[model samples]
Target: GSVETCMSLASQVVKLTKQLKEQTVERVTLQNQLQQFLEAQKSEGKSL
Candidate 1:
């Protein structure tokens, strides 16, 4: 397996981040995924 990034820590300030894994995908594509996640959570059977 390939490692893109790694986080190791003790008592530290970690600069948490989010990296778009699929470099070929567009920003709009990420927005679409987030929106779909929200929509799925709103569904009755899957409600939070």
Candidate 2:
């Protein structure tokens, strides 16, 4: 029983870690997109 419980907990931790990795990657990509957009706006001569 203890072994089953331990395995279950480990599975949950693995799942959570995967989800965190995915969201972090997505957030970084979107963050870069916004940064690029801002840079484009500045290059186009818009005032800060």
Candidate 3:
């Protein structure tokens, strides 16, 4: 549960960050995974 909270935060910050430089694609790739997790969370009636 705690780790999920941190991942949610990480996902938001990654989505909002404008200073990613060359790391944008890689981070965004990871972000998509976070998104998938969030979607699953939502389906289970959990907050994303």
Candidate 4:
């Protein structure tokens, strides 16, 4: 019975880890887009 409980908890932890990894990648993507937008605006001002 204890072994079964431990296995269940382990599975839960694995699921949580996967979700965290996915979110980290998504956050990085958003930051990259923001950086690009900022650079584009800067360039636009310089051109004028």
- What would the TM-scores of all predictions be? 0.36, 0.67, 0.46, 0.63
| lDDT string, candidate 3, 1-48, tens digits | 788999999888877674565487878888999999989888889644
Give residue 4's lDDT in candidate 1 (0 to 100). 31
Better of 1 and 4 by lDDT: 4
lDDT of each: 0.54, 0.92, 0.82, 0.92
Ranking of all predicted structures according to TM-score, beginning with the best and ending with the worst: 2, 4, 3, 1
User: Which regions of candidate 1 deviate over 4 angstroms?
Assistant: 1-25, 45-48
Model 3, CA-based lDDT: 0.82
Candidate 2 off by > 4 Å: 1-7, 46-48
In TM-score terms, candidate 4 sits at 0.63
Residues 1-48, candidate 1: write the lDDT tens digits.
233333234212243222333443667788789888788777855755
Error of 3 at 2 (Å): 57
List, residue by residue over 3-23, the lDDT tens digit for candidate 2.
898999999999999999999
In candidate 4, the residue pairs with backbone N, CA or C atoms under 3 Å apart (3 or more residues apart, or in different chains) clash, namely none
lDDT of 4 by residue, 1-48 (tens): 698999999989989999998999899899899889999998998896
Residue 8 of model 4: what lDDT?
Answer: 95
Which residue pairs collide, candidate 3? none
> Candidate 2 at 37: error in angstroms?
0.5
Q: List, in order, the clash count of every candidate structure.
A: 0, 0, 0, 0
